[PDB]
Amino acid sequence: VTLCSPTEDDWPGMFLLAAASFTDFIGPESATAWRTLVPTDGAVVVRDSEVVGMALYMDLRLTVPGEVVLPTAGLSFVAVAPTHRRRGLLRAMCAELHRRIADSGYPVAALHASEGGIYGRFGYGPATTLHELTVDRRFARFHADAPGGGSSVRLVRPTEHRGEFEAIYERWRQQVPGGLLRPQVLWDELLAEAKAAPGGDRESFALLHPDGYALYRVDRTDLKLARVSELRAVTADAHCALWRALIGLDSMERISIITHPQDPLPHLLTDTRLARTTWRQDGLWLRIMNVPAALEARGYAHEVGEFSTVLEVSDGGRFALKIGDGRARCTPTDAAAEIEMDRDVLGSLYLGAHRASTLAAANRLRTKDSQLLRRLDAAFASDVPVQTAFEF
Amino acid sequence: VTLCSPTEDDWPGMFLLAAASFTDFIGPESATAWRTLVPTDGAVVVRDSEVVGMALYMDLRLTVPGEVVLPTAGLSFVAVAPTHRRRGLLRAMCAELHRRIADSGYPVAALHASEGGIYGRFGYGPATTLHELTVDRRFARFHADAPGGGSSVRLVRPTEHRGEFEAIYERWRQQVPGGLLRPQVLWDELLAEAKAAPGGDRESFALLHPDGYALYRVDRTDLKLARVSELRAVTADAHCALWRALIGLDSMERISIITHPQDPLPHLLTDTRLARTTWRQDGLWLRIMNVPAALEARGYAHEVGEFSTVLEVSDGGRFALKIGDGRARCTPTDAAAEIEMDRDVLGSLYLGAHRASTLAAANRLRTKDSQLLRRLDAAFASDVPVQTAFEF
Amino acid sequence: VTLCSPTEDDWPGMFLLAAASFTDFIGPESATAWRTLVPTDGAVVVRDSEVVGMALYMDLRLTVPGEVVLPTAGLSFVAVAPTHRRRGLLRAMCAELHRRIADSGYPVAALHASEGGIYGRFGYGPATTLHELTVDRRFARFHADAPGGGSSVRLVRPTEHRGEFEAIYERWRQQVPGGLLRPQVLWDELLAEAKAAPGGDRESFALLHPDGYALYRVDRTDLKLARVSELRAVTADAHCALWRALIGLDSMERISIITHPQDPLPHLLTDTRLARTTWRQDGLWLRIMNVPAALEARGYAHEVGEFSTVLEVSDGGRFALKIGDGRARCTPTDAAAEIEMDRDVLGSLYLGAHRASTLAAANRLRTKDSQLLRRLDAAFASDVPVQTAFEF
Amino acid sequence: VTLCSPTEDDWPGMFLLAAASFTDFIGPESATAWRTLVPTDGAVVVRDSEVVGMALYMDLRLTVPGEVVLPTAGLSFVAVAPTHRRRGLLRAMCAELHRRIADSGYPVAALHASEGGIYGRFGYGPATTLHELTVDRRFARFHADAPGGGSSVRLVRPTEHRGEFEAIYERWRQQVPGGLLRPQVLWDELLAEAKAAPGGDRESFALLHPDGYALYRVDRTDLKLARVSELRAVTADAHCALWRALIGLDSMERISIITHPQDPLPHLLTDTRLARTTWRQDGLWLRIMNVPAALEARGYAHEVGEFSTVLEVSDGGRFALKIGDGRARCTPTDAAAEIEMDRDVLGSLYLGAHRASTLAAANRLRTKDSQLLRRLDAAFASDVPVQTAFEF
Amino acid sequence: VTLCSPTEDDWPGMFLLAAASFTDFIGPESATAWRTLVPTDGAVVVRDSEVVGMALYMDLRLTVPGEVVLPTAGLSFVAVAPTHRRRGLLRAMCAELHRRIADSGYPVAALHASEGGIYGRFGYGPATTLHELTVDRRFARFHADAPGGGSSVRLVRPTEHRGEFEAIYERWRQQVPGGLLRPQVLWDELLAEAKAAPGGDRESFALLHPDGYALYRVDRTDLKLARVSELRAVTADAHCALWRALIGLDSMERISIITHPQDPLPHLLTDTRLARTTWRQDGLWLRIMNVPAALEARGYAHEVGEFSTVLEVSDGGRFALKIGDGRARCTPTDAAAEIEMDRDVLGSLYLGAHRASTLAAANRLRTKDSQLLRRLDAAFASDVPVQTAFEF
Ligand SMILES: N=C(N)NCCCC(=O)c1ccc(F)cc1
Ligand SMILES: N=C(N)NCCCC(=O)c1ccc(F)cc1
Ligand SMILES: N=C(N)NCCCC(=O)c1ccc(F)cc1
Ligand SMILES: N=C(N)NCCCC(=O)c1ccc(F)cc1
Ligand SMILES: N=C(N)NCCCC(=O)c1ccc(F)cc1
Ligand SMILES: [Cl-]
Ligand SMILES: [Cl-]
Ligand SMILES: [Cl-]
Ligand SMILES: [Cl-]
Ligand SMILES: [Cl-]
């Protein structure tokens, strides 16, 4: 069992492992496209010679609070053959990729987790939260105060308006923490999933506004449910207008969307309760590779005074942290630590999705100063609510 | 159809309406106990003479941010006979009770809503959020960092340790926004629901720590599910210890609790995802009766500079609002309004459960200043997370 | 295995057989009340000595078309021990009771069937049809044309208004084909089933109009469903008013009732489809004991000319049948038969629930004259639609 | 928003709206075939320019009581974009098509309704009733009296016996109220739905008798259920023989068919209850365009004396109606009305599916004469029971 | 209705009957391959001329206790048209095939039964038992004593390792009672079912050991269930190693397999209960064609002394049976019978799947000697447990 970068001959063996490992495996055509986002030496394989282990990272651009875009290593296609479990192959592959990511100069790594129990021990913390809202649209009445009391929204074929979706998404991802650049190969892939599959998914439709879109399809088996796969809105007007159109799908009983906890949809209706939360789960996970680089890169709340502390990350360094005027300075120190946490915990705070005082309550984050806790809570909070871009 | 305070002879007619109106009706014995919390002239009935309409308020004590306790009118037992719908009887009864509540000097009214669509139009906004967490306890492993790595928790009969529950609850309700004083009649009622009912609920058990308790019972029909009816913990140690004991119910597959969005339980486990959010709903609703009295009574975040604005409440007054040093001064003015909202919206902000920028996004809250929005968000936020005490 | 009238000592043995035979067995207290409607020598038992077989008839009064009331033998409590199946005990018991019923001078016998396959061979035909309608009351809007565009309907406790229900029911049963006299013991029984049972059925409520009532209860397990056990209305106004009140049960999603195919409820709503037919089954079964007596006793449609034919009932006699002016004369003859049918078929036509041309289509009813078929269809039809009174 | 006849360039835009509006949309190939039944100027579209609104009628031939065939405008493909709801586009499109249908000389219009609440207000009433019967065929034994006590029925491939199905259907539709001419394009379409679809419906089989056929297929997901899509039988022998063959599908637990309330199948079995009614819904809806033309065109029951009355249709004319010898004469008058009804109510009576006395009971039909009610009931009744041909 | 061997022209008619008779019909391509295993005059058809009846046998090789391979007539493709039920066509076809099978010199016939009630009366008895085990693999821990405490198992594409599966299966079928030779056409068919079907089954994967394989696929609809279609293991090591790999499918909740009652999997786990038996059914059915030939051909338990008896088979002959040294001698006699049974009962004993004392308890097997019963039980038992090869 040696650990190597895969040659062109290794990829059929990797696709076999993928097929047997991932029930949602996108198949070798789509896999070969996503592959274009993997840099030279971005992938590792373990051979026995068939492929019994693999992992790779993609070059991503992640928006963080203060509309700052970070180079991000996006982990994906991680798999150990069922024949080689509990043999330390994951530990080995994760260690080599983290070495390579660190040496390449990425301040953060990110992934989507298949189980919530695997990734904490490698320094990844859940950084965004997925909310499923299901609206019973038969009772849905808009509030007097809701914007848009002619319709600016058009029902369209997704493939005929690619440029407009690209332009809107590009605006969206640049101003939203959790936003990812979507390169051209992923627009190629997204608009191929929009066509109907014989015995599979139904045709996708689009609702297009100047400042937003929604892609939706009727569910395979429940023909009274519309699944909104993606709603990107750059103004409140766009968001409301798109939801007026979705509530107008009179052949449907229910509209479902995977969104964020701060989605304003419930407040657009006369009955907040009609927008039921049917599902909640961790979205994007972050590993802070370089603590000082990441802490200095993001903006902080202007609505908190200048304050200084010493942060210790468990086997990750000790740092003098000074926050003021929505900037941070983060420098080496051996001064006594005022706040202790494992690396994963820092990942979870980084995008504002979790409160420091909540992680303190579970003792994932030790300090003896209540005042420092409130200051961290306020400073790390994001004015624009954190959202999840797309699964990778 | 006249509107009157009920005499002793009206209560059998009110109990009939209750039985036919509420599927969870507690019956006339329990109803007669809850009645002791209704002041003279706290109830109205509409006669035709049988009772075709009723509503009342109870004298409550509600903890708000800054550990301030407000006298609160608690609306309950509101019902219109199925024979007298769409006749304006609710509008009439709500108007008379609000007159009486206002004249009596209550700064706020509160209720639990049977539908999320009825109460917005009378100035009530949802002020607390209920989270159901279901733990699959077979996979539940505690984190290395979790407190309590002898057990201080005892399995006990609820009725044998009333004083200890009273003392712990009394500590809890005084330091938690959403907390209500539980008077002696409601402890009498709570510990009567703890006994098993032939063909009904199973026996309730208690887990008792010096600084917390949990009351739980096995579900009637699902015999692999324990329902935690109530967990009150005054320290993180108490909270963790009680959850160690609950995960130790080895005859159960699942533990379910109705808690708050900031419950730290997910962070105590090695897998955050095991604590699934299975249900989410509005808890307590607030009507701010006297805007200046309520705004001045609660504490605000110390972690935001002094700032001034003009708040207009739709048909509720215009006010110069100055917030600094976690206090507010709220005085009459005719100066141009910088922030507009309906009364219900103010109720929803009041306990910190909803962000101003989220209600702005739905246009329930109009301002032309982004900076004022961020300041409101930060100032109205609560360091202690808002919880729900008990249904009334 | 001898066949005898039971002595007082046989009834405990009969109650044992009942308990083991009928899952809905009403128990020995209620059974002892229903027993008061069984005449001397109205019951048979087969002993082996334990009771291995039993059957009895009750003295009933059945309304038939033209508001004519017939003495009717009501078969009930029919059971063969599981230890004595396929031994001809049913055939024996049915033969002895039919002999006794015939000799006593009953023109018709009736029963409610436990299986639809047992009773055809003894000359019983299904004579009334049960429709379950379920209304989703959240979408229910009344039509502009619906009567009742003060409410005359009261929500009441059933036991406090017995006289009013008796008076309304008595009016109803006298003018409706399928109507049965409800004696005092069955009002005693009906109003005892109105109280709540610990671990059983919930409390029954009543909606009372001068010319109608509805008894309803919430379902044990589905707490969003109200089951209307009984709705008796003597005017269209009463029927509509009661349904306005039932649609006003705002805590319910669904109202269900067991009614008749000609219930006008669907036509009272702006959407006929909201009143879904969820269940359909045979109600009352008739055995015509004396063909000429029964045919002469009921009224016929005035809206068909005088016509004559010869009816043969298979091993039941041949008769010259003359119908005109809504009366029939039915006399012995040996003239060639124009219409042939088994006895059960006659039972099925007798109350107007089934069309002759439909039974002809299945060849349960042979004739070589299409014109005679249309005449029978029209003459046997009932202007007041046939309903089912109560199960016995 | 202008209203126009569509050009060849509008149809791709109409197909987009169809796809997003109808979950059962037959697709553009099949749509282009059905299009051949739309006359010049039979379609309207609303442009904004994309298609935001459409409606059309097809040239149909509808059999009415007395085996009379009427030219019928068949409304279909009616849709308003989700972006243009509650804008009066339906009201506008329905008004223009009704103008065109009226001016073209159609006595009646018809449709199949997507919701039971949309079409009453435009003068359409439900005119036929759909019964689903499900037979548990494992218990199904035929009655001694059932016809067919060699088999004349053949199991065949539908596409190899098109001429025989055409000939049988043509005989069926000419003698059955509700019957529609099926033109050649719809036989092309029907026999293309008979082939198996990969991941879709299973292969269709045919049971062929000289005087009837049944097309059936096994359900996609329930492999113990056979769905009879269509059973056309011109004699009782044919009907029974086909059902003997269907009960002979020994690999099936259940046979289901959508039929009419007067289907004689229950009476062919020793247990009527085995043929459970599992579903009931409105079939064809009628709008009487020209009251006198329609009333004069159909035959009436010969089994009722000559009688005269004055019929008022709400904003539809007042008419002297004389019925005798199964013909009607319907002429203008200003004499006092004896019977009042909205137009939709007339549609519902027209094919005999609903009784006048039932609509009177709901006050959809006002008269002060009970005798006139019984006469209408009897005269409007159909000797051949009303059935539904095919959905359009 | 004549009975004939089918010509080449009859097969399209037979495929039609198959399609309408069998929901799992493999289609005409696969049917034409299986056809290569049918000898000249191995098939019968009944014509009316369409095919209304068919049956055939295939040339099989069945392993019986003592690793003896018997020529076996494998009945399959047996069908009577739904139009020709209860006409004695099955009785006729079964009689002609049994004549042909007997005259050809087959000692035994075998089939898989569609219903458990059809085949007893033609002398077939259930001879093997199917156990479904479902493992919840999340709790599955292997016992300290389990073999395999490098992995020898490989995850592979089935079609790339045909020779290895053939070699392993060939070893398996030769040493296991119930084993069938799998000819090349059935390997062609098996490895075509291994590819994914659009809207159908998912891709099949293989786990390959030197001395065993497992073919498995994820279920269509339950994406947390892996279905093991086939596990062939020639050593305990191979069996355990393959199950270590299957429990290693970490994306799955459950692994299901159809196996035999003596599968040792439950004993490999620390918790025997994790391997739940979810389904149990008769597998292969045997008809002993020639009693003496079959009884003499198989080996018997060496662990029972020499003993002699007289066996009578109902209308099948009387025989002197002597068993010793694991051989039997079976010769004609007219001596009084000590043991009586119908032919089907002999089929059920023949492979050791059922105990004589169990069939005696149900009186399917009469003797007056308890000692003879114990001797039969012990002698007929198989040291290698009886398994089922593949459905035909
Ligand atoms: N999780 C999802 N539904 N889609 C993400 C697809 C990621 C993926 O398969 C992949 C495949 C090959 C690569 F080189 C990189 C990534
Ligand atoms: N909602 C719950 N489960 N319990 C609250 C019970 C409130 C109640 O019924 C009541 C009854 C009588 C009164 F006077 C005041 C209140
Ligand atoms: N079928 C129902 N739900 N009730 C009918 C009760 C009839 C009955 O048990 C009975 C019992 C004793 C008698 F003597 C006569 C009748
Ligand atoms: N409702 C169904 N299942 N089939 C009816 C199809 C009707 C239809 O789509 C259509 C399409 C185009 C036209 F020009 C006319 C009609
Ligand atoms: N029962 C299964 N799933 N497969 C067995 C297929 C047997 C079969 O169809 C067949 C078809 C044609 C023949 F000539 C012989 C056999
Ligand atoms: Cl999102
Ligand atoms: Cl809470
Ligand atoms: Cl009824
Ligand atoms: Cl039909
Ligand atoms: Cl097996």
Q: What is the DSSP string of A323-369?
A: EETTEEEEEE--SPPSEEE-HHHHHHHTTSSS-HHHHHHTTSEEES-
**Which residue among A16, A17, A83 places its CB closest to the CB of E248?**
A83
In this structure, what token pair is assigned to residue C321?
Answer: 């049948």
Q: How many whole angstroms separate alpha carbon E237 and alpha carbon A184? A: 51
Give the residue carrying structure tokens 């080599």: A96
The per-residue DSSP string of E37-105 comes to GS-TT-EEEEE---EEEEEEEEEEEEEETTTEEEEEEEEEEEEE-GGG-SSSHHHHHHHHHHHHHHHHT
User: In chain C, which residue's Cα lies nearest the Cα of B17?
Assistant: C155
Q: How many whole angstroms separate alpha carbon A253 and alpha carbon B259? A: 30
Q: With contact defined as beta carbons under 8 Å apart, do C359 and C285 qualify?
A: no
Give the residue carrying structure tokens 């003496």: E292
Q: How many whole angstroms separate alpha carbon D209 and alpha carbon D226? A: 19
Chain centre distance of CA B1: 33
Contact yes or no for C143 and D362 at CB 8 A = yes
Domain with CATH 3.40.630.30 in chain E: 1-127+283-287, 128-282
- List, by residue number, the catalytic residues of A: 119, 392
**Which residue among D157, D198, D245 places its CB closest to the CB of E83?**
D245
Chain centre distance of CA A181: 12
Ligand 1 pocket residue status of A146, Cβ below 6 Å: no
β-pair partners for E45 = E4, E54
Cβ-count burial of B268 within 10 angstroms (0-12 exposed, 13-18 middle, 19+ buried)? buried
Q: How many whole angstroms separate alpha carbon A212 and alpha carbon A172? A: 9
User: Which residues does B277 contact at the CB level (< 8 Å), separation at least 6?
Assistant: A277, A279, A280, B131, B132, B133
Cβ-count burial of B198 within 10 angstroms (0-12 exposed, 13-18 middle, 19+ buried)? exposed
β-pair partners for D287 = D109
Method: X-ray
Cβ contacts of A377 on chain B, cutoff 8 Å: 303, 383
Tell me how far apart the 2 most distant CA atoms of chain C are, in Å: 67
The C-alpha R_g of chain D, in whole angstroms, comes to 22
**What is the amino acid identity at position A266?**
P
Q: With contact defined as beta carbons under 8 Å apart, do B318 and B334 qualify?
A: yes
Q: With contact defined as beta carbons under 8 Å apart, do A127 and A386 qualify?
A: yes
In this structure, what token pair is assigned to residue B373?
Answer: 């929005």
Domain with CATH 3.30.1050.10 in chain D: 288-383
The strands making up B327-332's β-sheet, listed across from edge to edge, are: B327-332, B317-324, B307-313, B339-341, B365-367
Q: How many whole angstroms separate alpha carbon C390 and alpha carbon B51? A: 32
Residues with CB under 5 A from ligand 9 (ion): D 260, 387-388
Q: With contact defined as beta carbons under 8 Å apart, do D232 and D172 qualify?
A: yes
The CA-atom distances, in angstroms, between D306 and each of B351, D115, D322 are 79, 39, 7
Q: How many whole angstroms separate alpha carbon C354 and alpha carbon C369? A: 19
Residue E130 has a CB neighbour count (10 Å cut-off) of 19
**Which residue among C146, C363, C378 places its CB closest to the CB of D236?**
C363
**What is the amino acid identity at position A268?**
L
Residue B35 has a CB neighbour count (10 Å cut-off) of 17
The SS3 call for residue A274 is helix
Q: With contact defined as beta carbons under 8 Å apart, do B169 and B182 qualify?
A: yes
Atom of ligand 2 nearest to the CA of B112: 1
Residues in chain D preceding a C-to-N separation beyond 2.5 angstroms (breaks): 48, 149
Ligand 4 pocket residue status of D213, Cβ below 6 Å: no
Residue C86 annotated as binding site: yes
| A-B Cβ pairs (cutoff 8 Å, strict) | 139
Q: How many whole angstroms separate alpha carbon B114 and alpha carbon C94? A: 56
- State yes or no: chains C and B have 3 or more CB pairs below 8 A: yes
Query: What architecture is the C288-383 domain classified under in CATH?
Result: 2-Layer Sandwich (3.30)
Q: With contact defined as beta carbons under 8 Å apart, do A236 and A211 qualify?
A: no
Pocket perturbation via mutation, ligand 4, pick of D14, D37, D76, D391 by most ligand atoms within 8 A of CB: D76
Check if CATH label 3.40.50.300 holds for domain C128-282: no
Chain centre distance of CA B42: 20
Residue A200 has a CB neighbour count (10 Å cut-off) of 12
The per-residue DSSP string of B180-248 comes to B---HHHHHHHTTTTS--TTSPPPPEEEEETTEEEEEEE-SS-TTEEEEEEEEESSHHHHHHHHHHHHT
Q: How many whole angstroms separate alpha carbon A207 and alpha carbon A214? A: 5
Ligand 2 pocket residue status of B76, Cβ below 6 Å: yes
Residue D87 annotated as binding site: yes
Q: How many whole angstroms separate alpha carbon D123 and alpha carbon D344? A: 4
Contact yes or no for A20 and E157 at CB 8 A = no
The SS3 call for residue A310 is strand
Q: How many whole angstroms separate alpha carbon D162 and alpha carbon D170? A: 12
Q: How many whole angstroms separate alpha carbon E300 and alpha carbon E295? A: 10
The SS3 call for residue B371 is helix
The per-residue DSSP string of A98-113 comes to HHHHHHHT-SEEEEE-
Pocket perturbation via mutation, ligand 1, pick of A17, A22, A34, A130 by most ligand atoms within 8 A of CB: A34
Cβ-count burial of B238 within 10 angstroms (0-12 exposed, 13-18 middle, 19+ buried)? buried
Residue E245 backbone class (left: φ over 0; alpha: ψ -120 to 50; beta: rest): alpha
Q: How many whole angstroms separate alpha carbon A391 and alpha carbon E223? A: 19
**First and final CA of chain E: distance in angstroms?**
28
User: In chain A, which residue's Cα lies nearest the Cα of E220?
Assistant: A23
Which of D250, D252, D253 is best to mutate for the E interface (most E CBs within 10 A)? D250
**Which residue among A156, A199, A246 places its CB closest to the CB of D199?**
A199
Is B119 considered catalytic here?
yes
Q: How many whole angstroms separate alpha carbon B194 and alpha carbon B189? A: 9
List chains touching B (3+ CB pairs under 8 A).
A, C
Residue D69 annotated as binding site: no
Q: How many whole angstroms separate alpha carbon A20 and alpha carbon A27? A: 11
Ligand 1 pocket residue status of A31, Cβ below 6 Å: yes
**Which residue among D116, D342, D375 places its CB closest to the CB of C271?**
D116
Residue A88 backbone class (left: φ over 0; alpha: ψ -120 to 50; beta: rest): left
Q: Nearest CA to B233 among B224, B244, B222, B223?
A: B244
Q: Which residue out of D57, D77, D106, D119 is catalytically annotated?
A: D119
Atom of ligand 2 nearest to the CA of B58: 15
Three-state SS across A142-189? Answer: ECCCCCCCCCCCEEECHHHCHHHHHHHHHHHHHCCCCCECCCHHHHHH
Ligand 2, atom 12: nearest CA belongs to which residue? B31
β-pair partners for E31 = none
Contact yes or no for D82 and A155 at CB 8 A = yes
Residue A86 annotated as binding site: yes
Is C124 considered catalytic here?
no
β-pair partners for B307 = B323
Q: Nearest CA to A379 among A265, A313, A311, A300?
A: A300
Task: Name the DSSP letter for residue B20.
Answer: H
Task: Name the DSSP letter for residue D184.
Answer: H
Residues on chain C bordering chain B, Cβ-to-Cβ distance under 8 angstroms? 150-151, 153-157, 198-200, 203, 205, 207, 218, 223, 245-246, 248-251
Q: With contact defined as beta carbons under 8 Å apart, do E229 and E216 qualify?
A: yes
List chains touching D (3+ CB pairs under 8 A).
A, C, E
Atom of ligand 1 nearest to the CA of A58: 15
In this structure, what token pair is assigned to residue B322?
Answer: 């100055």
Cβ-count burial of A310 within 10 angstroms (0-12 exposed, 13-18 middle, 19+ buried)? middle
Helix (H) / strand (E) containing D132? strand D129-136
Distance from CA of A201 to the nearest CA of E (A): 10
A80-103 burial string, b = 16+ CB within 10 Å, else e?
bbbbbbebebbebbbeebbebbee
User: Which residues does D8 contact at the CB level (< 8 Å), separation at least 6?
Assistant: none
Q: Give counts: helices (H), strands (E), chain C.
A: 11, 19
In this structure, what token pair is assigned to residue B231?
Answer: 């967990």
Chain centre distance of CA B274: 26
The CA-atom distances, in angstroms, between C346 and each of A300, C289, D272, D385 are 89, 11, 15, 21
Ligand 4 pocket residue status of D186, Cβ below 6 Å: no
Q: How many whole angstroms separate alpha carbon E363 and alpha carbon E315? A: 17
| E strands, chain C, in order | 2-4, 43-47, 51-64, 68-80, 108-112, 125-126, 129-136, 154-156, 205-209, 212-218, 225-233, 254-259, 275-282, 284-288, 307-313, 317-324, 327-332, 339-341, 365-367
The CA-atom distances, in angstroms, between A36 and each of A96, A163, A192, C247 are 21, 21, 17, 62
Residue D384 has a CB neighbour count (10 Å cut-off) of 17
Helix (H) / strand (E) containing C343? helix C343-349
β-pair partners for A208 = A154, A213
**First and final CA of chain B: distance in angstroms?**
28
Residue A114 annotated as binding site: yes
Q: How many whole angstroms separate alpha carbon B11 and alpha carbon B241? A: 46
Ligand 1 pocket residue status of A34, Cβ below 6 Å: yes
β-pair partners for B132 = B258, B279
β-pair partners for A215 = A206, A230
Question: Given this structure, which CATH class describes domain C1-127+283-287?
Answer: alpha beta
The per-residue DSSP string of D43-81 comes to EEEEE---EEEEEEEEEEEEEETTTEEEEEEEEEEEEE-
Q: Nearest CA to C348 among C68, C116, C50?
A: C116
Contact yes or no for E81 and D155 at CB 8 A = yes
β-pair partners for D259 = D131
Three-state SS across A116-149? Answer: CCCCHHHCCEECCEEEEEEEECCCCCECCCCCCC
Q: With contact defined as beta carbons under 8 Å apart, do D186 and D390 qualify?
A: yes
In this structure, what token pair is assigned to residue A292?
Answer: 């000082």
In this structure, what token pair is assigned to residue D236?
Answer: 């009782």
Residue E386 CA to ligand 10 center (angstroms) comes to 8
Chain centre distance of CA D367: 29
Residue E92 φ then ψ, to 5° = -65, -50
Give the residue carrying structure tokens 């008379």: B96
Q: How many whole angstroms separate alpha carbon E42 and alpha carbon E218? A: 38
Q: With contact defined as beta carbons under 8 Å apart, do D60 and D181 qualify?
A: yes
Q: With contact defined as beta carbons under 8 Å apart, do D355 and C386 qualify?
A: no
Q: Which residue out of B119, B300, B319, B380 is catalytically annotated?
A: B119
Q: How many whole angstroms separate alpha carbon D16 and alpha carbon D83? A: 14
- State yes or no: chains B and D have 3 or more CB pairs below 8 A: no
The SS3 call for residue A25 is coil
The SS3 call for residue A381 is coil
β-pair partners for B218 = B226
Task: Name the DSSP letter for residue B41.
Answer: T
Q: How many whole angstroms separate alpha carbon D381 and alpha carbon E177? A: 71
List chains touching C (3+ CB pairs under 8 A).
B, D
Pocket perturbation via mutation, ligand 3, pick of C17, C34, C229 by most ligand atoms within 8 A of CB: C34
Dihedral sign (CA B221, B222, B226, B231): negative
In this structure, what token pair is assigned to residue C287?
Answer: 């055995």
Distance from CA of D133 to the nearest CA of C (A): 10
Ligand 4 pocket residue status of D77, Cβ below 6 Å: yes
- CA B270, B272, B274, B279: dihedral to nearest 10 degrees? 160
Residue D98 backbone class (left: φ over 0; alpha: ψ -120 to 50; beta: rest): alpha
Q: Nearest CA to B212 among B237, B181, B247?
A: B237
Residue B270 has a CB neighbour count (10 Å cut-off) of 17
Ligand 2 pocket residue status of B216, Cβ below 6 Å: no
β-pair partners for D332 = D319
Q: How many whole angstroms separate alpha carbon D381 and alpha carbon C171? A: 30
The C-alpha R_g of chain A, in whole angstroms, comes to 22
Helix (H) / strand (E) containing E276? strand E275-282
Contact yes or no for D303 and C267 at CB 8 A = no
Cβ contacts of C280 on chain D, cutoff 8 Å: 276-277, 280
Helix (H) / strand (E) containing E112? strand E108-112
Q: How many whole angstroms separate alpha carbon A94 and alpha carbon A86? A: 14
Ligand 2 pocket residue status of B10, Cβ below 6 Å: no
Ligand 2 pocket residue status of B390, Cβ below 6 Å: no
Q: With contact defined as beta carbons under 8 Å apart, do A166 and A187 qualify?
A: yes
